[model samples]
Target: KQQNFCVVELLPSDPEYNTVASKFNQTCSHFRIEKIERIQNPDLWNSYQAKKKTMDAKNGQTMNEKQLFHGTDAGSVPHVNRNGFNRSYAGKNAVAYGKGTYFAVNANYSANDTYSRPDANGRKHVYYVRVLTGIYTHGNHSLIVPPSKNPTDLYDTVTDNVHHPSLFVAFYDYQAYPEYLITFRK
Candidate 1:
């Protein structure tokens, strides 16, 4: 019996070419990358290179600095968070009603915050596990919403201060993921 599934090489001239090209030159833990003359777009390639460089630099940094980003998943590797545990950030955005909001730990802290302290370079860093259950909330208004409706209401149930045990997250800043730091889902 003859099997008839065809695979074609994609060129940069076609639409969504990078989508197919990515599989040919993916960044992974295993050194089993396929050899090919495929080249992704300049911006896309630079982004990929940036991510790679960030990971390489972090490899020589402290444990705290290392946990700032997610690890590479190459070959038969299991998808896990920086904590090396089975982690997923799916559906953590909205409220869970009466149970609580699945708040994410905002790793990007302010200048005064402990984690955002700069070294010689401007890149701030931290270990994800250390502040896994630190401060979290919703709404980016300047006005502060205290964690209390009243003295009777001990916690900020009225606002988005409520949190559940399932705290999966990424960057929560109004801006975007810091270009200087590596990206992660935790």
Candidate 2:
């Protein structure tokens, strides 16, 4: 295929880009991602860089109506909830007849989720995780509506909370892939 876009490249010697040149990752045992760029390819480094283009060009790419978010006029991910999830604890949200609402507060008390702790820049923030499930009655049957399972890509840095949420989900592709971290107030 003829190339219509430029691949951004990150070289091993580059300042910010050089940090990913190694195959080692202490974060996870599986899938070590090293060296991400769109520039010229380098030897001994697996690269990753999204092909960039104008919104017009992006829309030009082939995708289904559901793939592009047209069906989600209400902004819901459309999926079901499951059990045994890491943060599946009852949260502030209410539970109704036969359904449940749950959440997990990084609940790692030993690590000190105290809001008084300061960061490298002298700013301290409280952190936690919340997963919700809703069971509702429909017609003669009941349906379980999973909370927005969108791994919460939009980091709310503007808030007074800390977030770097992770999830190992399954079942519903839209929900399982991107577990959401819906916002809440104290």
Candidate 3:
């Protein structure tokens, strides 16, 4: 079997997803893809996991820089709407946290394996994932005050009056057809 891959960059929601598709019965703001590039690299993500362990050990409770820069949690990463669209569990009544540092890739990526999915018309297209991320994890929770000293940038961006980070991208589901859907809950 041939393996195909690509990096999918997207904004959480587009207005069209809200008015037209209503994806997954959830509020689906449209997603605008950035690029479909050949994915190449060894187990860089494995190395990233190792780095995470190192960072975790050093912080000892406080967040390391990556978590501070991108509000990455298994539960939180999936919900990008908290950052912008009101579809999150917080309802339309959430706050806006300001932006934070997002570093660039700075280097070229090598080609990896390749495979594909058929579009609605049946022509094959690139493989993808929803690339959402941010500094705050938004949900039905409030941002904790310092002494805890978590990253405040994403906490501040969500301006509806809650304390949490906004989400950035999206990921594809088991379905082969790709549509942008943002998910959030209190």
Query: Which has the greatest lDDT?
Result: 1
Query: 35-117, model 1: which lDDT tens digit per residue?
Result: 11222123433443454454445434422111122222221011111112221321222333222212223333211223234
The number of the candidate with the highest TM-score is 3
Give the Cα lDDT of each candidate.
0.27, 0.22, 0.25
Residue-pair clashes per candidate, as listed? Answer: 1, 17, 36
Off by over 4 Å in 1: 1-118, 121-123, 129-145, 156-186
Model 2 regions lying over 4 Å from their true place: 1-4, 20-24, 28-35, 39-164, 168-186
The Cα RMSD of model 1 versus the native structure comes to: 18.5
Give the TM-scores of the predictions, in the order they appear: 0.19, 0.19, 0.24
TM-score (C-alpha) between model 2 and the true structure: 0.19
Count of backbone collisions in candidate 1: 1
lDDT for 11 (candidate 3): 34
| TM-score of candidate 3 versus the correct structure, residues matched by position | 0.24
Residue 33, model 2, lDDT: 30
